[PDB]
Amino acid sequence: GGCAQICVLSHRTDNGGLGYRCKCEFGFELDADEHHCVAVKNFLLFSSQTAVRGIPFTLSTQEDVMVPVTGSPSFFVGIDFDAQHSTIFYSDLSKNIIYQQKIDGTGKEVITANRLQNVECLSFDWISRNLYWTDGGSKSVTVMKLADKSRRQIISNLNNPRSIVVHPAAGYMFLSDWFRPAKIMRAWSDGSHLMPIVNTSLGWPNGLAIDWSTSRLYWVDAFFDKIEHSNLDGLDRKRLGHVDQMTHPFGLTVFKDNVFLTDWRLGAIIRVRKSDGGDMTVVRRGISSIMHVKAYDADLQTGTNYCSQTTHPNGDCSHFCFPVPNFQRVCGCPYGMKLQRDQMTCEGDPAREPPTQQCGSSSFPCNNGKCVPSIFRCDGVDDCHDNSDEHQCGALNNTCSSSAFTCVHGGQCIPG
Amino acid sequence: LYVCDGDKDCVDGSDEAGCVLNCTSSQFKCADGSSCINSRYRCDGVYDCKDNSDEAGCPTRPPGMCHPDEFQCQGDGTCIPNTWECDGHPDCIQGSDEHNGCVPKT
Amino acid sequence: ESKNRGIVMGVDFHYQKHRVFWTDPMQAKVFSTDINGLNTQEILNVSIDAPENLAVDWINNKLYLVETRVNRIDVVNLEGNQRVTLITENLGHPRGIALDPTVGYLFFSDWGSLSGQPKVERAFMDGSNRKDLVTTKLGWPAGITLDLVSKRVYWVDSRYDYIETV
Amino acid sequence: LCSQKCENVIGSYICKCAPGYIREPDGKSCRQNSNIEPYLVFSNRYYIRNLTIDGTSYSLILQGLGNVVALDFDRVEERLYWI
Amino acid sequence: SHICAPGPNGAECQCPHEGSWYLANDNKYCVVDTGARCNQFQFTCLNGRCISQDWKCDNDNDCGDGSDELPTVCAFHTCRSTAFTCANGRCVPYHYRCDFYNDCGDNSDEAGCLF
Ligand SMILES: *[C@@H]1O[C@H](CO)[C@@H](O)[C@H](O)[C@H]1NC(C)=O
Ligand SMILES: *[C@@H]1O[C@H](CO)[C@@H](O)[C@H](O)[C@H]1NC(C)=O
Ligand SMILES: *[C@@H]1O[C@H](CO)[C@@H](O)[C@H](O)[C@H]1NC(C)=O
Ligand SMILES: *[C@@H]1O[C@H](CO)[C@@H](O)[C@H](O)[C@H]1NC(C)=O
Ligand SMILES: *[C@@H]1O[C@H](CO)[C@H](O)[C@H](O)[C@H]1NC(C)=O
Ligand SMILES: *[C@@H]1O[C@H](CO)[C@H](O)[C@H](O)[C@H]1NC(C)=O
Ligand SMILES: *[C@@H]1O[C@H](CO)[C@H](O)[C@H](O)[C@H]1NC(C)=O
Ligand SMILES: *[C@@H]1O[C@H](CO)[C@H](O)[C@H](O)[C@H]1NC(C)=O
Ligand SMILES: *[C@@H]1O[C@H](CO)[C@H](O)[C@H](O)[C@H]1NC(C)=O
Ligand SMILES: [Ca+2]
Ligand SMILES: [Ca+2]
Ligand SMILES: [Ca+2]
Ligand SMILES: [Ca+2]
Ligand SMILES: [Ca+2]
Ligand SMILES: [Ca+2]
Ligand SMILES: [Ca+2]
Ligand SMILES: [Ca+2]
Ligand SMILES: [Ca+2]
């Protein structure tokens, strides 16, 4: 049909009597001639109990831009994106795993499955290619480097941390804690400094967003039901007008002249203007347990910093490179390691940070970096989603669980 | 149970014919008569039934002031919970909720 | 026979290729086979977690799927290697799908749209122009089929317990 | 020393505004937070008059009365009473 | 700077008896007393002059004499986290790294550059 990617039948009278139309595969979009395809720049992402999926910003079109992410069971909460590889990162609480996946559905990989309890926010730094997440069970903020899969925990002893956003150009990290007294906190990328930038008149600061056209910070509060925005020092502060039915906001993002918001009580996505509020538009309704909203933008992830310069890569740091304010870099080492006089380089620290075993005593270590109770080892079902636990069981080397049932001739075990 | 609930469970609507809604005291009824909804949803900021009757007849904030179960901040004219006044933490912009007039907890 | 404790939910065929296609929501998979029972293959497994019904287009060699985890109507190649989503807007409980490639019409049913109404609906095979074909005296429409010589649509309802034609 | 009310300290004082008011960075002055603008109402021999506190606007509430010596108002029912 | 003694917990420093003196830079340096004592976070040179501490051991002569660059300082000084370090035991700002200029004692500032 002269189409670049896909040709689909229409009514015989449609398209001037040609009877066909052209469509582009996931991750692609249609161009002015309605025949050729171009790669998507802008689309919105949102997460919910059942699914993580993305939709276009033009409300005239309401068909998904990416292959939806869904599994059995599912409870998605935290999401971020990587544009240079057409990838999204998502966290699942029903499995306590963080995954990376491609918007065409062709790839799925596990970032980590180890020592995640209540992860309910992900942030991604694209100059250094670092991933940050918040956990409310361990009450901590953790950072990982994806090339080496190197892990360090940089903030601890928080009360109820919820949301984290990272700014690579400014070298700042922002965090929110909603245990009374609630606070919004600023840190450096390595977590070396930490200070509350907002602690007055905050009840439930559930969500944070960054505005890049102005270098400003936005937060939404569910106790007082308000949207506020400030400058990154917290010293200039303004409040947007009353949103019509917003009564328990949770998630926030900012794109061009608009601010996008999610409400639990409505189970809805709302769009208003970031300067004033108002002009309420409802993008979706009836979403079962809607959690987070995030904006995919390839242009946002353009940039350079001292960690990314081609003539001296990774800031000469061996493991971690962190941007910090006033356009300069810092180096870090993973958990089992220490820094050397030339801070570029790392060494091993068995004194202060010895090695640790994967899962402790009363659990089975699964090959994907996950821990499950010993009773589950051969109960007949894949309690570890790599199917590690049910591997080579019923054989003479591994007898089966008392909860399971065993097949007499076969020596294979099935749930009771 | 199907004889009158709200759904036409058979073709001609023999069920739901001639009913009068009689929901219990734990619920609220809406002005045009179409729906009854639990009490928690009355006066919650969300229009839970058509014609907005669940939110129409609701208390409002007096002009420039706060409810008797609230506290007001001198520096910003904003309302916070009564408990927040004098609990060691400055909630107001100027921290006026932690004034010198309060007494300790042993 | 459904492997690995699965079931067969929806079935559709292609005649000039000797193929039969079916859906499994317990395995979350879509399968194709030759009508002689040989040459059996799996063609979609990435996000079809609760399929119900299939339709096939024999003029353009396309396969249409109804999905309910995320309410979707999707279009693929018989091999599974190209994919599009056509209808997403108001689907609450899509259950039935039927096609006429000669005229270029798509018919589908929903027993609980997000707007609240049960619906039987007509569309263009690309999803462009949409029309409500039945809304009066309609309960739980579960299946649609077409008569192509007389150009009639037949559908079945399980709440009001009838089989009816337009 | 303070607009509205103030409270004693063993070596100093502090200033506070009543409900419905905001305290400016002066630390000693109060401003009113209602969107409603105040106005003045006064009664002449034959008339009741309406005036703005900035002196910009003058108006008549009622005319042709005999000798209006006293006024008062009621907020609850939005009423005006006179002798 | 002048005289050292092995006191408890470490070394102690004393200045010559020949005049009026003052102790600076963790009392490890000796200065000749005329007042004019300097502010916090600075570094001082024996000619009685004060500079921003970052210039310390930067391989540049900040003062009328090289007190800022002496081994007595740079054997114990450590480079800040946001800096770059060379085998010389010297610290340079990172943007100088691979700038086509030396800025260290060795070629290390420009060593290994991918151009
Ligand atoms: C609240 O934030 C201000 C910001 O300057 C800070 O000075 C103060 O210590 C903070 N209060 C608490 C209890 O952390
Ligand atoms: C409503 O319920 C009350 C209490 O059972 C009963 O007395 C009354 O007759 C009922 N009215 C109708 C119309 O059902
Ligand atoms: C999905 O199908 C492809 C193609 O046959 C196969 O390689 C892959 O293993 C399948 N994935 C799962 C999870 O079954
Ligand atoms: C005039 O104001 C009174 C105030 O109590 C009100 O009751 C009445 O309805 C008003 N009438 C008109 C015509 O506005
Ligand atoms: C060991 O435990 C520490 C502290 O919890 C870290 O989680 C570390 O990641 C663990 N082990 C390994 C193999 O890194
Ligand atoms: C077989 O091993 C399982 C653990 O997988 C249980 O411990 C079970 O009690 C064992 N049973 C026998 C008979 O050894
Ligand atoms: C709310 O109640 C107050 C009295 O406390 C006033 O009557 C006001 O007019 C009411 N309505 C609004 C919108 O504030
Ligand atoms: C401690 O609290 C008790 C509560 O009954 C009393 O208020 C007591 O006066 C307090 N102690 C002091 C030292 O004031
Ligand atoms: C030198 O390094 C030590 C750690 O070995 C301390 O961090 C000290 O603060 C550093 N001093 C400077 C000036 O960088
Ligand atoms: Ca609320
Ligand atoms: Ca198991
Ligand atoms: Ca189990
Ligand atoms: Ca009924
Ligand atoms: Ca309500
Ligand atoms: Ca307080
Ligand atoms: Ca006094
Ligand atoms: Ca120097
Ligand atoms: Ca150089």
Short mmCIF file of C-alpha atoms in Angstrom, two decimals, chain A residues 64-397:
data_model
loop_
_atom_site.label_atom_id
_atom_site.label_comp_id
_atom_site.label_asym_id
_atom_site.label_seq_id
_atom_site.Cartn_x
_atom_site.Cartn_y
_atom_site.Cartn_z
CA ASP A 64 -1.29 3.23 23.38
CA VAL A 65 2.14 4.28 22.14
CA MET A 66 4.01 1.36 23.77
CA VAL A 67 3.36 -2.33 24.36
CA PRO A 68 1.66 -2.42 27.79
CA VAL A 69 3.47 -4.11 30.67
CA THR A 70 1.33 -6.57 32.61
CA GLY A 71 1.79 -9.86 34.42
CA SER A 72 0.06 -12.27 36.78
CA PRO A 73 0.21 -11.10 39.62
CA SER A 74 0.95 -7.37 39.26
CA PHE A 75 1.21 -4.23 41.37
CA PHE A 76 3.27 -1.59 39.55
CA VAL A 77 4.17 1.58 41.46
CA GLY A 78 7.42 3.22 40.33
CA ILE A 79 8.56 3.97 36.78
CA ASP A 80 11.18 5.94 34.88
CA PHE A 81 12.57 5.95 31.33
CA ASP A 82 15.78 5.81 29.30
CA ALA A 83 15.46 7.38 25.85
CA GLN A 84 18.78 6.46 24.22
CA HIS A 85 17.72 2.78 24.23
CA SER A 86 13.90 3.14 24.03
CA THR A 87 13.60 1.55 27.47
CA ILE A 88 11.50 1.98 30.59
CA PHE A 89 12.26 0.89 34.14
CA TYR A 90 9.43 -0.32 36.36
CA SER A 91 9.10 -1.81 39.83
CA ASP A 92 6.66 -4.54 40.86
CA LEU A 93 5.65 -5.00 44.50
CA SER A 94 3.86 -8.32 43.95
CA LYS A 95 7.30 -9.68 43.00
CA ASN A 96 9.58 -7.05 44.60
CA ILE A 97 11.60 -6.82 41.39
CA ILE A 98 12.82 -3.95 39.23
CA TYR A 99 12.73 -4.59 35.49
CA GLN A 100 13.83 -2.79 32.36
CA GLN A 101 11.78 -3.32 29.22
CA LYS A 102 11.57 -1.90 25.72
CA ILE A 103 8.60 0.05 24.40
CA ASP A 104 8.19 -2.43 21.54
CA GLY A 105 8.01 -5.28 24.07
CA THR A 106 10.97 -7.11 22.54
CA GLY A 107 13.23 -6.93 25.59
CA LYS A 108 12.82 -7.58 29.32
CA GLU A 109 15.63 -7.74 31.87
CA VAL A 110 15.98 -7.60 35.66
CA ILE A 111 17.99 -4.79 37.22
CA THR A 112 17.85 -6.25 40.72
CA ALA A 113 15.71 -8.60 42.79
CA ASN A 114 17.71 -8.38 46.03
CA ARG A 115 16.67 -6.68 49.28
CA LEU A 116 13.71 -4.73 47.91
CA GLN A 117 10.81 -4.43 50.35
CA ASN A 118 8.50 -1.46 49.59
CA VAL A 119 10.11 0.28 46.62
CA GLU A 120 7.71 3.00 45.51
CA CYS A 121 9.80 5.43 43.45
CA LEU A 122 12.42 5.25 40.69
CA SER A 123 14.54 8.09 39.29
CA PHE A 124 17.05 7.84 36.45
CA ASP A 125 20.15 9.94 35.79
CA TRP A 126 21.04 9.68 32.12
CA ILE A 127 24.39 11.48 31.90
CA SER A 128 26.06 9.04 34.30
CA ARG A 129 23.47 6.29 33.67
CA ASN A 130 22.60 5.73 37.32
CA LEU A 131 19.30 4.54 38.78
CA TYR A 132 17.94 5.64 42.15
CA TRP A 133 15.10 4.16 44.13
CA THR A 134 13.38 4.74 47.45
CA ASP A 135 12.34 1.99 49.86
CA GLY A 136 9.94 2.53 52.76
CA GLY A 137 10.64 -0.80 54.43
CA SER A 138 14.39 -0.44 54.61
CA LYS A 139 13.77 3.31 54.96
CA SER A 140 16.56 4.10 52.54
CA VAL A 141 17.63 5.50 49.19
CA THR A 142 19.73 3.26 46.96
CA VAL A 143 21.71 3.95 43.79
CA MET A 144 22.84 1.47 41.16
CA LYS A 145 25.07 1.72 38.10
CA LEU A 146 23.69 -0.36 35.24
CA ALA A 147 26.85 -1.01 33.21
CA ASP A 148 28.53 -2.84 36.10
CA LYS A 149 25.39 -3.42 38.21
CA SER A 150 27.17 -1.81 41.14
CA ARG A 151 25.11 -0.94 44.20
CA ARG A 152 25.43 1.48 47.09
CA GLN A 153 22.98 2.80 49.69
CA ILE A 154 23.39 6.53 50.17
CA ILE A 155 20.64 7.73 52.56
CA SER A 156 19.31 5.82 55.55
CA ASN A 157 17.12 6.22 58.63
CA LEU A 158 14.34 8.09 56.83
CA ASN A 159 10.88 7.87 58.37
CA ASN A 160 8.44 7.45 55.44
CA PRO A 161 10.24 8.29 52.19
CA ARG A 162 7.97 8.31 49.14
CA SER A 163 9.27 10.18 46.06
CA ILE A 164 12.69 10.93 44.57
CA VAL A 165 13.67 13.11 41.61
CA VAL A 166 17.20 13.72 40.34
CA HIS A 167 18.66 16.68 38.44
CA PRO A 168 21.97 15.83 36.71
CA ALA A 169 22.76 19.30 35.36
CA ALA A 170 22.29 20.94 38.76
CA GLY A 171 23.90 18.06 40.63
CA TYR A 172 20.98 17.81 43.05
CA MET A 173 18.68 15.09 44.33
CA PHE A 174 15.28 15.76 45.88
CA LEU A 175 13.35 13.53 48.25
CA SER A 176 10.09 13.58 50.20
CA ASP A 177 9.18 12.10 53.58
CA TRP A 178 5.59 12.15 54.82
CA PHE A 179 5.93 10.93 58.42
CA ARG A 180 4.89 13.84 60.60
CA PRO A 181 6.71 16.24 60.67
CA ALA A 182 6.68 15.94 56.89
CA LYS A 183 9.58 17.31 54.89
CA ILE A 184 11.06 17.75 51.44
CA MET A 185 14.83 17.35 51.38
CA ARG A 186 17.66 18.24 49.02
CA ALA A 187 20.93 16.39 48.67
CA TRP A 188 23.83 16.05 46.29
CA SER A 189 23.82 13.19 43.81
CA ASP A 190 26.16 11.10 45.97
CA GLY A 191 24.04 11.86 49.04
CA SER A 192 26.99 13.62 50.68
CA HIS A 193 24.83 16.52 51.89
CA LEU A 194 21.25 16.52 53.10
CA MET A 195 19.01 19.37 54.23
CA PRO A 196 15.25 20.00 54.47
CA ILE A 197 14.38 22.65 51.90
CA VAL A 198 10.66 22.62 52.78
CA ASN A 199 9.27 21.72 56.21
CA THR A 200 6.53 24.34 56.75
CA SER A 201 2.89 23.54 55.94
CA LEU A 202 3.41 20.04 54.52
CA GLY A 203 1.06 17.22 55.42
CA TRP A 204 1.41 14.44 52.83
CA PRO A 205 3.90 15.44 50.12
CA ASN A 206 3.21 12.37 48.00
CA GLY A 207 4.78 13.53 44.74
CA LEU A 208 7.57 15.67 43.30
CA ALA A 209 8.34 16.87 39.78
CA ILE A 210 10.99 19.04 38.13
CA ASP A 211 10.31 21.76 35.55
CA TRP A 212 13.18 22.18 33.09
CA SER A 213 11.97 25.25 31.21
CA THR A 214 12.45 27.19 34.47
CA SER A 215 14.63 24.94 36.69
CA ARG A 216 11.93 24.72 39.35
CA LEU A 217 10.51 22.07 41.67
CA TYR A 218 6.83 21.16 42.08
CA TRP A 219 5.17 19.10 44.78
CA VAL A 220 1.62 17.99 45.48
CA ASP A 221 0.23 17.54 48.99
CA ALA A 222 -2.76 15.33 49.81
CA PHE A 223 -3.49 16.52 53.35
CA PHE A 224 -4.08 20.15 52.37
CA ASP A 225 -4.92 19.13 48.76
CA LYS A 226 -2.60 21.65 47.12
CA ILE A 227 -0.01 22.02 44.39
CA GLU A 228 3.02 24.16 45.21
CA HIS A 229 6.12 25.08 43.27
CA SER A 230 9.39 26.57 44.42
CA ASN A 231 12.92 27.21 43.32
CA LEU A 232 15.51 24.54 44.00
CA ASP A 233 16.68 26.26 47.20
CA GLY A 234 13.14 26.35 48.60
CA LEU A 235 13.46 30.11 49.13
CA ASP A 236 10.85 31.17 46.55
CA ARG A 237 7.49 29.44 46.94
CA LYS A 238 4.10 29.76 45.23
CA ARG A 239 0.78 27.90 45.34
CA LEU A 240 -1.46 27.05 42.40
CA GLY A 241 -5.20 27.57 42.39
CA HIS A 242 -7.83 25.17 43.65
CA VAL A 243 -8.15 22.08 41.48
CA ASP A 244 -11.81 21.18 41.09
CA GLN A 245 -12.03 17.65 42.54
CA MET A 246 -8.44 16.84 43.54
CA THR A 247 -8.77 15.27 47.00
CA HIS A 248 -5.91 12.74 47.33
CA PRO A 249 -3.15 13.38 44.79
CA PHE A 250 -0.23 10.95 44.61
CA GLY A 251 1.80 11.46 41.43
CA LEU A 252 3.03 14.50 39.55
CA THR A 253 4.87 15.33 36.34
CA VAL A 254 5.41 18.49 34.29
CA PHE A 255 5.46 18.81 30.49
CA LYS A 256 5.61 22.09 28.52
CA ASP A 257 2.92 24.52 29.81
CA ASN A 258 1.03 21.75 31.62
CA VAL A 259 1.20 19.76 34.84
CA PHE A 260 -0.14 16.21 35.00
CA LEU A 261 -1.43 14.69 38.21
CA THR A 262 -2.91 11.46 39.53
CA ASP A 263 -5.64 11.11 42.15
CA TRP A 264 -6.40 7.99 44.19
CA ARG A 265 -9.88 9.04 45.29
CA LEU A 266 -10.96 9.55 41.68
CA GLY A 267 -8.68 6.86 40.25
CA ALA A 268 -7.98 9.47 37.62
CA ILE A 269 -5.38 11.42 35.67
CA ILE A 270 -5.84 15.20 35.62
CA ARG A 271 -4.13 17.93 33.59
CA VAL A 272 -3.97 21.60 34.60
CA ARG A 273 -1.69 24.52 33.80
CA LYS A 274 1.50 24.91 35.79
CA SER A 275 1.41 28.71 35.99
CA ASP A 276 -2.09 29.05 37.45
CA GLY A 277 -3.84 25.73 37.69
CA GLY A 278 -7.26 25.66 36.12
CA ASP A 279 -8.41 24.32 32.77
CA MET A 280 -8.93 20.91 34.33
CA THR A 281 -8.88 18.12 31.77
CA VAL A 282 -9.31 14.47 32.73
CA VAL A 283 -7.14 12.20 30.61
CA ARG A 284 -8.36 8.89 32.05
CA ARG A 285 -10.82 7.76 34.71
CA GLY A 286 -11.60 4.53 36.51
CA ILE A 287 -7.99 3.36 36.71
CA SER A 288 -7.77 0.71 39.43
CA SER A 289 -5.21 1.91 42.00
CA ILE A 290 -3.41 4.44 39.82
CA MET A 291 0.05 5.19 41.21
CA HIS A 292 2.52 7.23 39.12
CA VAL A 293 2.67 9.45 36.05
CA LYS A 294 5.86 10.17 34.11
CA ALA A 295 6.65 11.95 30.85
CA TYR A 296 8.80 10.34 28.17
CA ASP A 297 10.86 12.98 26.37
CA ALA A 298 13.91 12.25 24.22
CA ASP A 299 14.95 15.91 24.15
CA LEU A 300 15.06 16.13 27.94
CA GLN A 301 17.68 13.40 28.14
CA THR A 302 20.08 15.25 25.85
CA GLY A 303 23.05 16.70 27.70
CA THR A 304 26.66 16.48 28.76
CA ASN A 305 28.59 16.67 32.03
CA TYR A 306 32.09 15.92 33.29
CA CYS A 307 31.05 12.28 33.77
CA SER A 308 30.16 11.96 30.05
CA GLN A 309 33.05 13.69 28.25
CA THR A 310 34.55 11.54 25.51
CA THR A 311 38.22 12.42 26.03
CA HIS A 312 38.21 11.25 29.68
CA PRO A 313 35.26 8.93 30.34
CA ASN A 314 33.31 8.44 33.57
CA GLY A 315 35.14 11.35 35.18
CA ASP A 316 38.10 8.96 35.55
CA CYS A 317 36.13 7.38 38.40
CA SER A 318 36.48 3.61 38.49
CA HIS A 319 32.97 2.63 39.60
CA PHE A 320 30.66 5.62 40.26
CA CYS A 321 30.64 9.16 38.87
CA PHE A 322 28.31 11.67 40.51
CA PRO A 323 27.50 15.22 39.36
CA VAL A 324 27.47 17.81 42.13
CA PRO A 325 26.62 21.52 42.12
CA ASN A 326 28.68 24.17 40.35
CA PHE A 327 29.55 21.85 37.46
CA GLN A 328 31.92 19.34 39.02
CA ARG A 329 32.04 15.61 39.72
CA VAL A 330 32.60 13.20 42.59
CA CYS A 331 33.55 9.51 42.60
CA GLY A 332 32.13 6.63 44.62
CA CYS A 333 32.67 2.93 45.26
CA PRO A 334 30.17 0.09 45.85
CA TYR A 335 29.25 -1.45 49.21
CA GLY A 336 32.25 -3.71 49.71
CA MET A 337 34.73 -1.03 48.71
CA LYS A 338 36.49 2.12 49.84
CA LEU A 339 38.08 5.11 48.13
CA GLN A 340 41.78 5.59 47.47
CA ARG A 341 44.01 8.67 47.82
CA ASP A 342 43.41 9.27 44.14
CA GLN A 343 39.64 9.34 44.60
CA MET A 344 39.29 8.20 40.99
CA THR A 345 40.11 4.68 42.22
CA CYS A 346 38.59 2.14 44.59
CA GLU A 347 39.85 -0.63 46.88
CA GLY A 348 38.28 -3.33 49.05
CA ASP A 349 37.21 -2.71 52.66
CA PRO A 350 36.80 -5.98 54.58
CA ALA A 351 37.18 -4.03 57.84
CA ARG A 352 34.10 -1.79 57.76
CA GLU A 353 31.99 -3.41 55.01
CA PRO A 354 32.59 -7.18 54.87
CA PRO A 355 30.93 -9.44 52.30
CA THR A 356 27.41 -10.65 53.07
CA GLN A 357 25.46 -13.72 52.03
CA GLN A 358 22.46 -13.44 49.74
CA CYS A 359 19.56 -14.66 51.87
CA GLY A 360 20.44 -15.63 55.42
CA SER A 361 19.55 -18.96 56.98
CA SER A 362 15.78 -19.52 56.71
CA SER A 363 15.50 -19.00 52.95
CA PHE A 364 16.52 -20.37 49.56
CA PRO A 365 18.81 -18.27 47.30
CA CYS A 366 17.36 -17.91 43.81
CA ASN A 367 19.59 -17.40 40.79
CA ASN A 368 18.08 -14.00 39.96
CA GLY A 369 19.21 -12.47 43.28
CA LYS A 370 16.06 -13.15 45.27
CA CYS A 371 15.23 -14.79 48.59
CA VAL A 372 12.27 -17.05 49.36
CA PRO A 373 11.35 -19.20 52.37
CA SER A 374 12.72 -22.73 52.50
CA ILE A 375 9.19 -24.15 52.68
CA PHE A 376 8.61 -22.75 49.18
CA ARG A 377 11.64 -24.53 47.69
CA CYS A 378 9.60 -27.38 46.14
CA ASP A 379 5.98 -26.59 46.96
CA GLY A 380 5.20 -27.00 43.24
CA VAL A 381 5.05 -23.35 42.09
CA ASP A 382 7.56 -20.75 40.91
CA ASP A 383 7.77 -18.56 44.00
CA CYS A 384 10.95 -17.23 42.40
CA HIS A 385 9.94 -16.00 38.97
CA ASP A 386 13.09 -17.37 37.33
CA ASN A 387 11.71 -20.83 38.26
CA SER A 388 14.88 -21.33 40.29
CA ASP A 389 13.24 -23.00 43.29
CA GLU A 390 11.38 -25.76 41.41
CA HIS A 391 14.60 -26.65 39.53
CA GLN A 392 15.81 -30.27 39.67
CA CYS A 393 13.45 -31.26 42.48
CA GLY A 394 12.00 -34.67 43.18
CA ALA A 395 15.35 -36.17 42.21
CA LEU A 396 17.29 -38.21 44.76
CA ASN A 397 19.36 -35.13 45.65
#
